[PDB]
RNA sequence: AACAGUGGUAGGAGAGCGUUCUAAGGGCUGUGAAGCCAGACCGGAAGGACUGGUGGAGCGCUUAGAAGUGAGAAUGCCGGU
RNA sequence: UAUCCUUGGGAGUCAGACUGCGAGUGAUAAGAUCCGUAGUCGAAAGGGAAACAGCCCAGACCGCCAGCUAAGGUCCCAAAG
RNA sequence: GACCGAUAGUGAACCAGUACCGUGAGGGAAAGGUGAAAAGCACCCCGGAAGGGGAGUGAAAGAGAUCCUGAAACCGUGUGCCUACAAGUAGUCAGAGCCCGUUAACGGGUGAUGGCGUGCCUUUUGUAGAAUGAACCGGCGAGUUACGAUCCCGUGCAAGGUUAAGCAGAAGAUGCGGAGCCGCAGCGAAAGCGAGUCUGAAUAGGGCGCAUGAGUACGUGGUCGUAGACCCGAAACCAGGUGA
RNA sequence: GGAACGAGGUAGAUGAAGAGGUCUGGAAAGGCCCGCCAUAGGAGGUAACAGCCCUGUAGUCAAAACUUCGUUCUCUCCUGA
């Protein structure tokens, strides 16, 4: 049978140009109050997956374009 | 295609079984017990190998001090004293010599004692 | 080549590893797997992205984004592609799929402008790109929309 | 290149050019070796099975109770490592075929006949029919034209009355231009192909 | 050729031996095949020959291909003792 | 002197042990326990410590009935005062 | 038929769902081969017979009914060397004596005596281990296959690469089949814009991209996913039946 | 519901070519030297491995009776802009 994608994972990564994964920073979806304001702009912008965890989880997303 | 067992089996113990003769009652009969004293055997037979370089020089060795002695010299010093007059001939040679002809060994230890007396 | 005489081109064929065959192939008893625990056992292993129960990285991230039933994707062409072409000639979707150029259409052609275009043509396209209508249009050709 | 054109008597009647891009061209011996094993593999029935422990008869019960009988324990009588049980793994239905890409099978093809023609093995007959079905009539046709050992016979379309006379005979295969392939080219050490053939493969090929 | 190096468990990598089957070439065999039994032969190893005895009809070799392909251990299964 | 870094393929490992040195816990006990640091073992055969994974000396590709040394020794066992 | 060849292949090559086991449902074996032809050993001898020894048949009886071949364990007979003062993981290295004569080799067999030396495996920091496994011999007995993903290697073509089902055809090769799939363009949640794009008030900065380019089809190999998924092993759970 | 016809199924028929010579051998189908048939060089058997020894095979034929399908005819039924 296909290899089925991992649904949770296609719902959070996005593939880049290079074949890089784009991802969103935790720690955005309350508290903001216990946050600083420098810390809310950083993890307003989205971030990379690293390598470390990228080889771990590369082969849920095979079927992503 | 299915690969039968066939003789392979019998022909590789064999050769082990026949290793093995002249081995004392099931180590010459049944293939593991004889299995494993063959492989001893190799361990035994590489650690002896150096070991026969050891007895033999200590052999050599014994064998000299006897003949030096009756030429009323120590091995010790018969050996410093071949070294001092440049006697390149080994213990091997030398203890052919004590037993095979000992006045030739008796004129390199009145060679010695000469380096010794110096 | 005769059929007593074949051999493969080196290195295109290799022998397949067989393990649990014996101390000296390398991967004998053991097979590669090492010394008992879950990864040793036979249909062992963990399932893809689990971390021993610390939360997997996808968990402790937020889902983003919704998908848009009505998104449009368009078969690009750049100007680079159209150079190809004869001087003269209307270069419309339908030449471009049977040419080979494009290879599905998708919801239209659109034309981009990367590269250069050194032809008078008369590209007939869905969509394009500020540079890209420009380009053509410099070039002497037309760029109509259809 | 130019090969001689004979005809069934065995006279040459002058020559022939082959078209290069077809007879030509230098021969890929690495596409060749795929081309057979591909081929050879695509001929495989591969209609072989075992009966695993779950499809050998019986062994429901568990041969004794897990403690106390001082035995191993065991499942079943039909595990695999019991006489009569289940095979672990071990031949099941499956097909060897596969292609290869379209542009590998021409070169292929052409590569093999190629080489025919740099051995001298490429005989073109101005063209091939016999009267009759009749197997003597072409053992004679062939020692006509010296051709000893294996030889594949290549007509233009489906001659039946040669195709007959063919048959019976040892490592003389009949094939229409259309049948022809890498394994029968390969395998025959002659090709007897007619005139009206070589053009009908270069049509397909060229 | 010179120089240097060459202990090894888990494990990674490479090069090989051997078994069954297929294809293609080339052979062996009732003047004795395979198997079996000896031997003091050969190769760096897996292993391979040669000779003789038994046996009484099948079997190697070269290149390639495909695997039910290699056992000393599982209180393994079965048989024999 | 000949490593080092980047990328990618495949791993195994998460029970460690002792010895010396610097500390904690303990009683300035433990072949105890927990760290730092170096070594050996693990995965290291050979020589010495009678025997003796972890101590001393020293790293086995293979042959030699050759030689020089290390720790440790040289009256006899047992080579050498 | 690059399926098995009598522990294999159906449980069953054979009077097998039989024998046997169970109250019953049910479980469930072992066991093939004289010879080309019975020409299946007339007759004689020992014996109550069995079983032998001749003689005949036959190519062969060392093919005589569990009758092709006949391995190992195991059990014996004969004897070339050794053995009754010796402490043995049974060998190995040294070594007389005695006895042989080979695939002719700085040979073979035996071994008074000397030196060294606590099996194999598994599991362990560490096992000669008084930890585990194996009475012995023989056979059988464990990373495989399908479909996907990814990487390396090989080949074809290359900004392109490739067909799937299906139709013709030897259960084939091949021809046709361009639907579809991947790549050449990315950025953004998206509208959308596009070698840029998103964020932002911003021709600012920054992120991801481009300039700094190779993919694709097929094959081999490594690994992974889904399948029993390297093999063996629970106590149990559930469903339908069989038993007072 | 019924005919006529065609092609099949359920038994069969016919069917080419060497005891060729010679060599071992218990026995040739094997070896050697020669032929011949082939729309037949599928296969099994025959005293060792047979296209030409047997049953067969290719090819061409064959059905009293039963049965399957097909095509015509009979038969049956029928207004739609
Ligand atoms: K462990
Ligand atoms: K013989
Ligand atoms: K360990
Ligand atoms: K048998
Ligand atoms: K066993
Ligand atoms: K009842
Ligand atoms: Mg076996
Ligand atoms: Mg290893
Ligand atoms: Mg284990
Ligand atoms: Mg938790
Ligand atoms: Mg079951
Ligand atoms: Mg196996
Ligand atoms: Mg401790
Ligand atoms: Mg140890
Ligand atoms: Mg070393
Ligand atoms: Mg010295
Ligand atoms: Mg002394
Ligand atoms: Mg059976
Ligand atoms: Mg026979
Ligand atoms: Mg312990
Ligand atoms: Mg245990
Ligand atoms: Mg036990
Ligand atoms: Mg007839
Ligand atoms: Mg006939
Ligand atoms: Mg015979």
Known sequence: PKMKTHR??????????????????????????????????????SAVVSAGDFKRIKQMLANIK | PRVKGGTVTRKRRKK????????????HTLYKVANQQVMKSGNYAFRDRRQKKRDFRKLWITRINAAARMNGLSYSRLMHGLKLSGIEVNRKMLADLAVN???AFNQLADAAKAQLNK | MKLHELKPSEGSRKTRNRVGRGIGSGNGKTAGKGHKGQNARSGGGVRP????????????????????????????????????????????????????????????VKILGNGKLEKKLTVKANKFSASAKEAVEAAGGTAEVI | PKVALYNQNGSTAGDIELNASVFGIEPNESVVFDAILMQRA???????????????????????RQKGTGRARQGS?????????????????????????????????????????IDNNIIVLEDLTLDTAKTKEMAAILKGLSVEKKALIVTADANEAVALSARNIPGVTVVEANGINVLDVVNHEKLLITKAAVEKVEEVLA
Request: a positive charge; hydrophobic letters at 30%.
């Open chain 3, 49 to 108: 992205g689990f971390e021993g129960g610390q939360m997997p990285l996808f968990q402790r991230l937020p889902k983003r984004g919704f998908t848009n039933i009505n998104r449009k994707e368009y078969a690009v062409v750049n100007l680079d592609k159209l150079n190809g072409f004869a001087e003269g000639t209307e270069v419309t979707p339908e030449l471009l799929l049977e040419t080979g150029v494009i290879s599905k259409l998708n919801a239209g």
């Open chain 4, 77 to 117: 009588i039909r595990s695999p490592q019991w006489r009569g049980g289940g095979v672990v793994f071990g031949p099941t239905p499956r097909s060897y075929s596969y292609k290869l890409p379209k542009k590998v099978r021409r070169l292929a093809i052409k590569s093999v006949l190629s080489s025919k023609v």
């Open chain 1, 8 to 45: 949770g994972s296609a719902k959070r990564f996005k593939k880049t140009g290079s074949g890089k994964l784009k991802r969103s920073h935790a720690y955005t979806s309350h508290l903001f109050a216990n946050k600083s304001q420098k810390q809310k702009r950083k993890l307003r912008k």
């Open chain 2, 101 to 103: 002809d000992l006045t």
């Open chain 4, 42 to 64: 695509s001929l495989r029935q591969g209609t072989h099975k075992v009966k695993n422990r779950s499809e050998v008869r019986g062994g429901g019960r568990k041969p004794w």
């Open chain 2, 16 to 27: 082990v079984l026949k290793l093995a003769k002249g081995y004392f009652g099931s180590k």
